[PDB]
């Protein structure tokens, strides 16, 4: 496992490190959206930051299951429950939870 | 565990596709057996019911009195490899000096063999085909003259950077396979494996490559199967300055180790486009010749 | 005893007293995908009786001037019953089909329909007539849904190929003096073990009159042709929300 | 897509915002075929 | 090691690190209807993975003044995914359920919810207050769908019975200082082997705060309660067209 | 036949409902065993986690030092039959001379035992109940006087014609069961089987009897289960002319061979209607008695 | 935090079917990846220069 830049938005030198992590914070209980990204590993986007994505570039075809492990780095006193979903081909970006 | 009867006795999950037919060795044409006059009631070989969908089972022996004939005529030349393993033209690439096309000393050809009717009509007899292939590249000037020029051919699979110039960094070809050869050398020749992500290439795909609304502007994607798109073939003259000669590269393909499924009607209208079966509606012609009357030769 | 038949599957039964046997396409029966041909890892769902049953989708009228029609599979069913719902909720689908085309008349009518199944039936256009225009068939023509679509040029099957050779595909004829239906069982045909029931039409059903309908004034002139079909061994995988296209 | 199932909850005294780091890799059934050149070429002019 | 848990069914997995074991209602697991208990003769359909999976249907906000809520089964799912479609296309339905109510806070919040399952939860009305009027609960109150419905008089569970005795039904408590969820597995409960998923609600899920939520100013005040549930051993029979009610 | 692995190994169809518990014989209260002082670490019987949903497993022996007690107190009187097989009033039918109700010498009573609170509160402790029953009919005048009058009781199952008069043709009772008895005779008494189409009667049905839109006007059908509607009980004085006496028929029921499932909270608000659990919203009273402070008796 | 990659597999996260995977791992060996000739040097021998 290598770090997946889910937060691939900042682009100025001084903010590059911010792409290595994304945030969560207290909300209003309406099952709000935290983040999204395509699962395509050999496509332009977050996966380019990973060593898998880069090695993938040296091959025309791939096959297999992928795995993304999310690590929470808030304080010990912070709790919470998230729903992480994978939508197979054909399904448009989910409008709601 | 299972307990209700309908579950124990169901056939759900049977992966063994039952087959009503099996192949037999047939290295020669069938022989003819002696037959004699038959004057029977009940027995009627000459009568069929074409509605069923099967072809007639009537044979020479049952329709006329035959002699014995030991037929040793071979069936070997009608195998798929016999029919397809003959190299034909499938691509032509021009590298002129003065021009409108590729005047910059390089060219990118999308690997698609449907631009030539002879070869295309043969492969389109089948819906799916799986095969390896031998590619041969014949190069010369537009007069067929052989000149002392060095060329580079490079296979650029989907996703690899397509050269955009005779001096593109992509020609470093560190992973893509490249061939360096002179027009003075014999035609270059290599073996290509079956590279599709699918189990077979298919000359017809009745569908769309993506999901969504299939509005007018995207209808050019009807029938587009990426499983058939193997990449780009790039060619350049090897130098930083323009070549002194105008060149032409003809591409021949010889399939080998062929397998094919689902035969279909053979094209009977001229081809117009590589990507589809469009035909000229104002020139729909009969499949073959015509005559003046049905009672006259 | 080959002229009579009963087809029972799911909660549906079909009877016919003027059949002409049954055709099993390419000589093989529908079957579920084996563990070695499969590639997708999720455990599939096999609804069985709720989706493998006969659906009567449409009726066309055979007239002395009719040119012929075609339907696409699995397109005709993507919006019908429980089969349609599974096709919409899942990315992957695979199945076979039992097709039963019905058309009866009287012993004084005549005519013959060719009923055939053509895998990967790609439709072409007339190219602006002159053939210089690269026009393409619209979505409603490539995937006409249950209503089907009428052939413009049956002789070349709207795709530059001779209908005279269509018999190289699984077929039966409905010749009025002989039978009143055609029955064809088709296995799953594709270069992949599963595919999208939405983006890909595995085969087309063609019903074309080759010998025109005829009868004398006074005989019932309305001669319907009805299309009934049943999915066999339906399997679905890749679950998520329903999508219509 | 990542959604809030309940909510990020914290008591008095702890930060109201925290971050998540994502790590990715392939499963053991993953393989690749048809060797090709990468889409990038990390050089502008000649490397001296 | 009893505080941690993973629930995997279908293509869905739930995790929790502050559980309080699992309750199996009336001590028995869901099972399919046996051939001797059954009465209907058509072969049922058992979709398996496409319908027996976790569906997260709704989130409520727990406030210091909340009175409590209830949901009806199988009502909450009759319009969701493949399960809903089968429930609509079929007359007969039967299944069990795995219910997972989620609610987390901080080690400085407090409060306790009673999570219980009450079979045949018939709702009553206040009878015009004076009790002389024979009023009846409207459809939206007896079968509230996914949004659930808020109790007007929790002390008598809006049905003239003491909530203090609700613990005689399969339950768990979500006491914030201890756990952040409740998990209850319920078998099919009825006097018949199958029934209408539309006309009959086998049981109700009650989530009621017994010890009010409390916390000091400054602590996250938004404390959601989310309802996730999975059908188990779903069976359907009596196929025909889809009906919503 | 089956071949794909996931099919062979699935549990789809298992009709054997696995049970986490089993019954044990318990004819007497449990005994008490000698216990002594325990001063341990790790062992903590007094501490529980009520959140789990189970009741405390702590016993006398582990909380205090106990002596041995051989308990022979019986558990026999708390069985379902012990509790329910006691006849109670469930119906009352008036046959007055001068009146507004049934002044025509006959009456039809819908078989519904929920009109009397004592009996009703006992049965509503359970959701489903299956039982046979013994019915006893006590008849006299409104003063409790016994008069020389002949009566006819007839059970009219759903679908049979309900008498509409003291002289109805339906009293021919050719198939329905009838009882002829005098008020001077002892109370009539018969045995009734479990007659529902369901496996059990149910005192609560959270649903509707039919499909369709459940608009306001039909909301009186919420909770109506025909499986609980066994018919009508008809009574008449046997004659073509009016009876000389005003009568009353009290109906008692004694269940026997009882089975019950799904216990539930017991009613704590007065009952208002037979058909539902409606309670008087302006008089919601505590389940029991109250006091002034939590620190005072 | 331990520094190891996840040990979770398809089988434990969702209900899977059986799949006999015969996809080769041969093209990702070091020789497969590196034994492809690439340009590494250019030498000019001009006349005028
Ligand atoms: C130095 C390196 O030298 N490299 C040489 C070299 C040669 C060939 C090559 O790939 C050959 C691919 C052909 C074998 C098959 C072409 N195919 C498949 C089906 N298809 C279809 C299907 C449906 N519609 C259309 N239009 C087209 C089609 O065109 C790659 C590299
Ligand atoms: C000469 C012939 O003498 N014949 C005597 C005779 C006596 C009794 C009789 O049938 C007795 C039926 C009872 C045993 C059960 C009554 N039950 C079942 C559940 N139920 C419910 C359930 C839910 N809501 C309401 N409101 C009511 C209810 O009231 C038939 C015939
Ligand atoms: Na597709
Ligand atoms: Na019902």
């Amino acid at each position: 496992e290598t770090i997946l830049e889910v937060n691939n938005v900042p682009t100025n030198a001084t903010s590059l490190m911010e792409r290595l992590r994304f945030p969560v914070s207290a909300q209003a209980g309406k099952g709000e959206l935290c983040a999204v990204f395509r699962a395509d590993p050999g496509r332009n986007g977050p996966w380019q930051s990973t060593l898998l994505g880069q090695l993938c570039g040296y091959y025309t075809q791939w096959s297999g299951s992928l795995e993304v492990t999310f690590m929470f780095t808030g304080s010990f006193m912070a709790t919470g429950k998230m729903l992480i979903a994978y939508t197979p081909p054909g399904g448009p970006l989910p409008k709601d939870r | 565990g299972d307990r209700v009867a309908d579950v124990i006795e169901s056939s759900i999950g049977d992966s063994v596709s039952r087959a009503l037919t099996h192949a037999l060795p047939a290295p020669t044409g069938q022989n003819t057996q002696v037959s004699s006059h038959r004057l029977d009631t009940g027995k009627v070989p000459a009568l069929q019911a074409a509605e069923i969908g099967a072809s007639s089972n009537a044979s020479d022996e049952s329709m006329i009195e035959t002699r014995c004939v030991l037929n040793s005529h071979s069936t070997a030349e009608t195998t798929l490899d016999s029919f397809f393993s003959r190299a034909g033209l499938v691509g032509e690439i021009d590298l002129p000096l003065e021009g409108t096309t590729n005047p910059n000393g390089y060219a990118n050809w999308d690997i698609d063999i449907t631009g030539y009717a002879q070869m295309r009509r043969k492969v389109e007899l089948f819906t799916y085909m799986r095969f390896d292939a031998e590619f041969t590249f014949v190069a010369c000037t537009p007069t067929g003259e052989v000149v002392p020029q060095l060329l580079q051919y490079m296979f650029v699979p989907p996703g690899a950077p397509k050269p955009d110039s005779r001096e593109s960094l992509a020609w470093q070809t560190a992973t893509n396979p490249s061939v360096f050869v002179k027009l003075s050398d014999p035609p270059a020749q290599v073996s290509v494996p079956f590279m599709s992500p699918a189990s077979a290439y298919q000359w017809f795909y009745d569908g769309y490559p993506t999901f969504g609304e299939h509005k007018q502007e995207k209808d050019l994607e009807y029938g587009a199967c990426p499983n058939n798109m193997m990449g780009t073939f790039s060619v350049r003259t090897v130098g930083t300055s323009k070549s002194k000669y105008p060149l032409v590269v003809r591409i021949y393909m010889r399939m080998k180790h062929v397998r094919a499924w689902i035969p279909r009607p053979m094209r009977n209208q001229n081809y117009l486009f590589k990507a589809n079966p469009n035909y000229a509606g104002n020139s729909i012609k009969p499949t073959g010749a015509s005559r003046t009357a049905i009672t006259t030769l | 005893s080959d002229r009579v038949a009963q087809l029972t599957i799911g909660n549906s039964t079909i009877t016919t007293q003027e059949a002409a046997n049954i055709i099993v396409g390419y000589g093989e029966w529908p079957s579920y995908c084996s563990d070695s041909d499969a590639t997708a890892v999720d455990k599939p769902t096999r609804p069985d009786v709720s989706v493998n049953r006969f659906y009567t989708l449409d009726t066309k009228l055979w007239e002395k001037s009719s040119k012929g029609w075609y339907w696409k599979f699995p397109d005709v069913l993507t919006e019908t019953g429980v089969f349609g719902q599974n096709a919409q909720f899942h990315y992957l689908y695979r199945s076979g089909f039992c097709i039963h085309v019905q058309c009866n008349a009287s012993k004084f009518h005549q005519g013959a329909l060719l009923v055939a199944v053509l895998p990967e039936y790609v439709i072409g256009t007339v190219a602006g007539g002159t053939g210089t225009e690269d026009t393409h068939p619209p979505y409603k023509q490539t995937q006409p849904g249950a209503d089907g679509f009428e052939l413009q040029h049956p002789y070349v099957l709207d795709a530059g190929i001779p209908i005279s050779q269509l018999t190289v595909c699984p077929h039966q004829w409905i010749n009025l003096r002989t039978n009143n239906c055609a029955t064809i069982i088709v296995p799953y045909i594709n270069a992949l073990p599963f595919d999208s029931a939405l983006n890909h039409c595995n085969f087309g059903l063609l019903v074309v009159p080759i010998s025109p309908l005829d009868y004398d004034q006074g005989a019932t002139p309305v001669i319907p042709i009805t299309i009934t079909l049943a999915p066999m061994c339906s399997e679905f995988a890749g679950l998520r929300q329903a999508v219509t296209q | 897509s990542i959604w809030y199932q309940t909510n990020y909850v914290v008591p008095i005294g702890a930060p109201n915002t925290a971050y998540i780091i994502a790590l990715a890799a392939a499963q053991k059934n993953f393989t690749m075929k048809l060797c090709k050149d990468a889409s990038d070429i990390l050089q502008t002019g000649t490397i001296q």
Side-chain angles (χ1 to χ4, degrees), chain A, chain B, chain C, chain D:
Chain A
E1 307 174 329
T2 49
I3 306 171
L4 176 76
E5 286 178 10
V6 174
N7 173 42
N8 59 316
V9 323
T11 48
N12 55 104
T14 53
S15 289
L16 288 183
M17 291 298 282
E18 299 183 9
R19 324 183 109 216
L20 306 181
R21 80 277 181 299
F22 58 105
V24 293
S25 64
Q27 306 292 305
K30 290 184 287 187
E32 32 276 300
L33 172 65
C34 171
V36 310
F37 60 97
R38 288 213 167 71
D40 306 12
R43 185 170 188 159
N44 287 348
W47 294 78
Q48 290 172 281
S49 71
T50 65
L51 178 62
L52 168 69
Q54 285 309 317
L55 289 176
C56 226
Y58 289 94
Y59 289 86
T60 313
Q61 297 168 27
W62 64 278
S63 173
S65 302
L66 309 174
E67 66 96 350
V68 178
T69 291
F70 300 88
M71 175 179 74
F72 178 59
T73 59
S75 76
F76 171 101
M77 299 296 324
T79 73
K81 299 184 184 298
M82 305 298 267
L83 167 339
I84 303 171
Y86 165 54
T87 300
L93 186 63
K95 49 167 185 169
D96 50 30
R97 182 235 268 157
Chain B
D2 311 58
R3 296 280 285 79
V4 305
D6 73 88
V7 164
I8 288 170
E9 295 172 50
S10 88
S11 56
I12 296 183
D14 183 54
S15 64
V16 182
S17 54
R18 289 194 304 168
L20 294 176
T21 76
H22 58 304
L24 300 186
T28 68
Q30 198 169 72
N31 300 347
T32 300
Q33 297 289 63
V34 177
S35 73
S36 221
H37 47 274
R38 176 171 54 282
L39 305 177
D40 293 310
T41 54
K43 290 178 175 59
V44 66
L47 293 180
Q48 307 294 311
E51 293 95 331
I52 295 172
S55 299
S56 181
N57 44 47
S59 50
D60 301 29
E61 287 88 340
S62 54
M63 297 303 290
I64 62 164
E65 286 193 54
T66 54
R67 67 165 295 151
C68 172
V69 180
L70 303 178
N71 188 342
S72 44
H73 297 170
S74 179
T75 61
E77 231 186 333
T78 39
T79 60
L80 267 30
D81 271 13
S82 273
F83 181 66
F84 291 119
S85 207
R86 316 174 89 83
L89 184 76
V90 293
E92 210 160 331
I93 296 175
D94 291 289
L95 288 189
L97 291 172
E98 285 247 312
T100 182
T101 61
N102 311 299
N104 303 305
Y106 83 92
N108 293 319
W109 180 67
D110 281 325
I111 309 182
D112 182 336
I113 66 152
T114 58
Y116 299 80
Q118 276 200 334
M119 184 64 54
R120 182 173 175 178
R121 197 195 184 225
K122 290 177 69 183
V123 301
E124 296 193 342
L125 161 62
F126 302 103
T127 315
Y128 307 108
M129 280 184 68
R130 180 192 178 92
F131 57 85
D132 294 310
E134 174 185 79
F135 275 72
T136 310
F137 309 100
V138 184
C140 50
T141 73
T143 60
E145 176 169 35
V146 179
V147 296
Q149 177 69 46
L150 176 68
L151 295 176
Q152 175 177 2
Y153 305 137
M154 169 169 85
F155 171 40
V156 185
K162 298 180 194 185
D164 63 308
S165 104
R166 180 179 58 235
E167 297 109 300
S168 179
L169 293 175
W171 299 108
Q172 283 175 27
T173 191
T175 307
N176 287 356
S178 281
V179 170
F180 287 87
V181 68
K182 308 178 182 79
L183 268 64
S184 69
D185 295 316
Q189 192 177 69
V190 305
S191 285
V192 180
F194 172 65
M195 311 171 280
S196 178
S199 290
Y201 293 128
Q202 74 193 93
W203 305 108
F204 299 98
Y205 172 69
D206 173 28
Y208 300 89
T210 61
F211 287 93
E213 289 184 299
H214 297 290
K215 297 185 172 179
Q216 296 290 70
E217 52 283 328
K218 295 299 175 189
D219 283 342
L220 63 153
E221 56 182 45
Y222 167 63
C225 194
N227 291 337
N228 293 320
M229 302 179 192
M230 298 298 96
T232 299
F233 183 71
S234 307
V235 48
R236 76 164 173 159
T237 53
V238 188
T240 39
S241 58
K242 199 185 224 62
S243 174
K244 290 182 175 185
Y245 325 80
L247 313 159
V248 181
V249 180
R250 284 177 178 72
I251 303 172
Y252 296 84
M253 174 185 81
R254 177 189 150 235
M255 300 173 265
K256 54 185 192 182
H257 312 154
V258 189
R259 297 182 67 187
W261 305 256
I262 311 300
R264 45 204 295 135
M266 297 189 89
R267 187 80 180 180
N268 72 336
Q269 298 306 315
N270 297 314
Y271 288 112
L272 299 181
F273 308 96
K274 303 184 199 176
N276 57 70
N278 286 358
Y279 51 105
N282 296 335
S283 313
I284 299 179
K285 61 178 179 183
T287 303
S290 322
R291 50 178 166 158
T292 60
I294 205 181
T295 49
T296 254
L297 297 187
Chain C
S1 186
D2 172 55
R3 299 269 294 139
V4 166
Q6 176 164 316
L7 307 175
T8 292
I9 185 172
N11 63 344
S12 59
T13 290
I14 296 184
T15 62
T16 168
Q17 303 196 55
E18 277 176 290
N21 212 326
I22 297 168
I23 287 291
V24 177
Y26 302 118
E28 77 183 60
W29 287 77
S31 72
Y32 296 82
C33 187
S34 80
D35 296 327
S36 47
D37 272 14
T39 184
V41 303
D42 64 320
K43 181 182 297 178
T45 173
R46 317 197 179 75
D48 202 45
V49 297
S50 74
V51 308
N52 308 314
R53 58 182 305 283
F54 282 116
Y55 296 100
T56 299
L57 265 28
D58 180 50
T59 297
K60 288 266 168 297
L61 295 178
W62 189 2
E63 305 183 323
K64 301 187 176 188
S65 53
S66 295
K67 276 179 303 178
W69 313 263
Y70 68 75
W71 289 262
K72 303 297 201 71
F73 290 65
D75 181 49
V76 286
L77 265 195
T78 55
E79 278 158 55
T80 302
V82 180
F83 175 92
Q85 288 310 115
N86 277 280
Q88 286 166 47
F89 273 97
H90 294 96
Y91 159 41
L92 301 180
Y93 141 83
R94 114 192 284 273
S95 95
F97 281 98
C98 176
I99 300 167
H100 187 71
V101 177
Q102 299 129 275
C103 179
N104 62 92
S106 86
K107 298 191 187 306
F108 290 76
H109 289 70
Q110 55 187 51
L113 297 166
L114 172 60
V115 183
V117 163
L118 170 59
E120 308 290 355
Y121 182 27
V122 177
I123 303 290
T125 80
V126 294
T130 57
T132 55
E133 229 187 343
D134 195 13
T135 57
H136 302 302
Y139 181 71
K140 76 166 188 294
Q141 203 188 323
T142 68
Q143 290 190 21
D147 289 299
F149 198 87
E150 195 185 315
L151 291 166
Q152 301 160 302
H153 301 101
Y155 188 80
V156 298
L157 297 167
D158 289 10
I161 51 175
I163 192 186
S164 67
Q165 291 166 23
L166 189 57
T167 52
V168 72
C169 297
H171 67 279
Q172 287 220 303
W173 295 80
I174 292 179
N175 182 23
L176 297 184
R177 63 181 276 106
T178 302
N179 55 312
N180 61 45
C181 64
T183 305
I184 307 168
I185 294 173
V186 183
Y188 184 60
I189 301 162
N190 200 351
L192 327 184
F194 284 75
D195 214 343
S196 171
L198 304 188
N199 303 338
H200 192 193
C201 283
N202 307 111
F203 66 88
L205 171 65
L206 283 138
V207 174
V208 178
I210 303 308
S211 189
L213 173 72
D214 206 348
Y215 50 88
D216 280 7
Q217 283 297 296
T220 309
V222 169
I223 307 299
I225 295 172
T226 296
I227 304 299
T228 294
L229 55 109
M232 286 191 266
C233 305
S234 301
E235 290 184 277
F236 300 91
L239 180 69
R240 29 84 170 148
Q241 71 261 39
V243 170
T244 43
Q245 69 180 312
Chain D
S1 50
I2 305 173
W3 308 77
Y4 284 82
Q5 181 70 347
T6 46
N7 187 21
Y8 168 99
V9 182
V10 70
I12 291 170
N16 288 294
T17 297
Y19 302 87
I20 291 178
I21 297 181
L23 301 144
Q27 218 74 303
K28 298 189 178 305
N29 62 347
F30 177 99
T31 62
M32 304 187 280
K33 71 163 172 146
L34 223 177
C35 230
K36 79 176 176 75
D37 271 301
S39 54
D40 299 311
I41 305 187
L42 304 188
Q43 105 185 78
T44 281
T46 63
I47 295 171
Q48 46 211 306

